[PDB]
Prior knowledge:
The complex is a heteroheptamer, with 5 copies of chain A and 2 copies of chain F.
Chain A: H1 4-9, H2 13-54, H3 60-69, H4 76-91, H5 97-119, H6 123-151, H7 160-218
Chain F: H1 17-31
PDB class: membrane protein
Keywords: inner membrane protein complex, Structural Genomics, Center for Structural Biology of Infectious Diseases, csbid, membrane protein
Assembly: heptameric
Amino acid sequence: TLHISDLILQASPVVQLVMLILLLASIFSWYLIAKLHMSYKKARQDDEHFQKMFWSGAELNTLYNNAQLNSKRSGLEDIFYQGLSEFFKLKKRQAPTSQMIEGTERILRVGLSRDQGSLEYGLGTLASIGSVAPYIGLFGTVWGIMNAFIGLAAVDQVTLATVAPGIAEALIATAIGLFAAIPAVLAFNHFTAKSESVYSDRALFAEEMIALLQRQSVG
Amino acid sequence: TLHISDLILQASPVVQLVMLILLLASIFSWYLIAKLHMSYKKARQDDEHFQKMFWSGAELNTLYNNAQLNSKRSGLEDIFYQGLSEFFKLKKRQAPTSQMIEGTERILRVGLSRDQGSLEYGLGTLASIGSVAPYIGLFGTVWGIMNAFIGLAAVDQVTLATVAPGIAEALIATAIGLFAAIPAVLAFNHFTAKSESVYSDRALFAEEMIALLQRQSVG
Amino acid sequence: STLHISDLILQASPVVQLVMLILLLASIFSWYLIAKLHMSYKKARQDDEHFQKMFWSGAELNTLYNNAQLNSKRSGLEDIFYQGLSEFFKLKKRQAPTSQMIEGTERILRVGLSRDQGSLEYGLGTLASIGSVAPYIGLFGTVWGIMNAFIGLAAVDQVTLATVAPGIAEALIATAIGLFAAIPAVLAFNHFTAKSESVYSDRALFAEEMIALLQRQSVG
Amino acid sequence: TLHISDLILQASPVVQLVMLILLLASIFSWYLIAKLHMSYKKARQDDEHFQKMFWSGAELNTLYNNAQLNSKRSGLEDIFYQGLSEFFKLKKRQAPTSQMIEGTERILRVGLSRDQGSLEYGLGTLASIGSVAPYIGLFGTVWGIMNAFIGLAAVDQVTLATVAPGIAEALIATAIGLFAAIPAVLAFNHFTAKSESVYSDRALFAEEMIALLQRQSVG
Amino acid sequence: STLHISDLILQASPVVQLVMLILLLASIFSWYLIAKLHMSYKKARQDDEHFQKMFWSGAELNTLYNNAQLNSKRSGLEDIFYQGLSEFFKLKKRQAPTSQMIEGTERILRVGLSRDQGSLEYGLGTLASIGSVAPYIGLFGTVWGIMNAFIGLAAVDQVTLATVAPGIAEALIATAIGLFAAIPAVLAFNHFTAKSESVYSDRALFAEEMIALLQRQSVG
Amino acid sequence: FERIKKPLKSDMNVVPYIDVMLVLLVIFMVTAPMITS
Amino acid sequence: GRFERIKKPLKSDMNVVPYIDVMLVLLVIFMVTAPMITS
Lengths: 219, 219, 220, 219, 220, 37, 39
């Protein structure tokens, strides 16, 4: 006649605090998963849109004008526009093509690093939560068992009916810790895989852009 | 066969959900292992076939033409065809030799990276499964011991029947966790090693190609 | 139970007592490192923003070079700037072309950034080691505690709670202290490596914009 | 009445051999820690002494002659000597400044790689010990549990007193296992961190060397 | 050891026997490959040091090239030198600028060095696989043994510990043999990858010194 | 030649699976002498 | 970014959680709880 809620509402203060921290960590992790999933979906959609717009065969300058007229550009549009704008910044001056190519590479690397840093917002937070939730839950379990045994060690001969439901309260600490750690680990692995995929795609596009610029610039 | 099929039913709904997720994960992992093994074997065969065709001493433009006629080409015969293509796209132009070789370098690197990324399709899924399944197995075991203790705390005279199904849940959960977690990690490690071997072989071949093109270009 | 855990520590096994002593010293050392590194990074952030606003106020490079001369207590980008453009002057006193001028300037900026960043991440590797290993020391403690519990069980003819209690007590306290000394180390290491990467990225961007501004001044 | 050394002497030969191997491994690990600690302390002291002498303000040719006259040339002094030997050899014949700097950079990189490899002598051995000693302890534990079961299969009635000394042996095996892995993992991590620090310091000094050489060469 | 181990290995459940047989064959194969690859590494190291001393013995470079010509069984770093300098002279016969000659020689040295390094560590991946797979296949064997021991008394008889103990005693042979076949594999893998790192570093540094000598002699 | 992928610096810890199992062993070894048929 | 070490790059493996000592722990639990519960 015992419920999980009946275990949660009454316990020692320490394990209750531990379970509260684990619940808050789980809620925070779910919020971060939702937000970062939305961000990755938007980034992927913008990436594919830009690839189809670029390799359509339209003039490179016309793509620059399209970037200029757009204000909401964030992804491959934005980094592409920075790169090409800096490239024409050196066409309007006089300089050899080699160091212009190096500068375009530098600005593309800066852009990729900036957008990737702003894109993986709280991935390290998920890493930390998934790494320490089981440890906090296990500490709660250890403290609950310790409190149960110290409270019931000299009161005559204790019966299973007197020690079992405090062991239950100790165990629920690590149960909640694993429940708050499963989403964190899953989302961290999946989302770092997606981050690697997106960054690889962006780097390959940057290399192809340098190839096209070099080929058209040498003449 | 029938006894385990009995004890998996009439379990607590959470632990039953645990066994369902782990069995589906195990099936999905085995499917991925089979498909990735077939893909890597086919990639190795095509690699060795193109190796013996290219180092046979045939003329270079003949190999390019055979790449042209083939439409279902994949692997090196594609990446080859790509890189040397840009070379001709630079040889129609009056680009210098060094820039020519650098462009061929870059197109070969892009092709190698893209095809190798397309080769490891679901390896990240194996990583996620092998990294999460022990957590879920431990959660199942903990919840089984939980249910055993809850049942024990309300029966007074604790028989074997009041503690049996919690322990049975814990052992089944941990067994399914091991069974769905070990072949994922082992396959991940093995297939990452094989992928690194394939990438090293492809990179060495692409460099040999650059060497031959440079030696032919200098005249 | 703060009145009785101390006593549980006293009559424990000597080797497990040594285990909890090492873990408590590790916990204190880790908290000291967390406090010191937090103070250092806060000071670094404040000085970074101060020098950014003092540069982009709109002053001229020679004046800020003089400020970098007189500020003997200079640190962070101050010193970075103080070094880099100094090399620029040291290749402007002799006649030199702008190409290797900027090459040498950016080399000095890179050396300064690497040196200061190495000086900034002082002991987070120690935090990594503590957070990675203290669970295993707790594992050793709990194994030895269960071992002593079984030795005491073997000695006594009849099984009794009074026989198994002290070994399980040692094991549980060892595991608890291991977790308590491990969790803050991991949290601090993740947070502080993320913030260190942020600082390094900002410094690298500043160095690039610095070389760009020196190039645009040199052409002008 | 059951002291620890009593069960060490009262032991099955296989587990006794396991603890003997683990104790020898622990002693060997401590010896390597002491030796590598002495080596790193000496290397750091020599590094700081040479940096302070080189930035004191003495003329470059004078310090080069001091390095040539010294027959020990431990560590970074040998790096200086090799770098400037290459630089003077390239300067003796007519050569452009860029080629001279590139050659000096390559010889400095070769020197740093060789000396840093020679500095971290037995780190791989600590890696192997810290990775394998727990598995040897595990083998000891498995054999102890095996022997406990074999001994149990003879006694008419089993109690806890008839199984405790076997489980104690199986547990002291893995206790000794864990004892021989803490000094190994800690030393490996701390010493690879120190190795990275020393190599970064040497590389920064080499870059400052290149800066000084280029500045003196431009004139 | 003890005749009891002989009693346990000469009779068991058939799939448990198959698992012991596969682990024994894996252990024998691992030992054979460790011996062979140790001999290969020792020969490679000896030849490497011999040619290093011969190359830095002050001998004229073209004389060393002609020695490479007249050698019939060149291997290791000898073939590396031969490929690099042969391709260098092949790009020297055609009119090529010095920079491209050095770049081509560097690329052929790197390709050949990667080729020879791959051909050197032949069975290292096999040690990796054995050290990763053996203990878990032994664990599977021992789990199947314990499950078989329990199901053999699914007809209840009695599940008392004194009756089921021999069924677990037979089962633990699987995991014991798995660990016994895994420890040599992991130890040799670690030691031999350390030796592989040493050999590769030595080869690469010699290649860089080769490039330095060729560049130095190129300018004249 | 280089593969295009960036390494990540944050790493996750192994699950304290053995620690929880030894806690369960402690619970069972303390609960065992309390049960009587 | 220019004076990096000359070494073959090292690849880490996804660490597998050891179930062997887990099975030993389960056998220890069985061994300590069986004599009381079977009689």
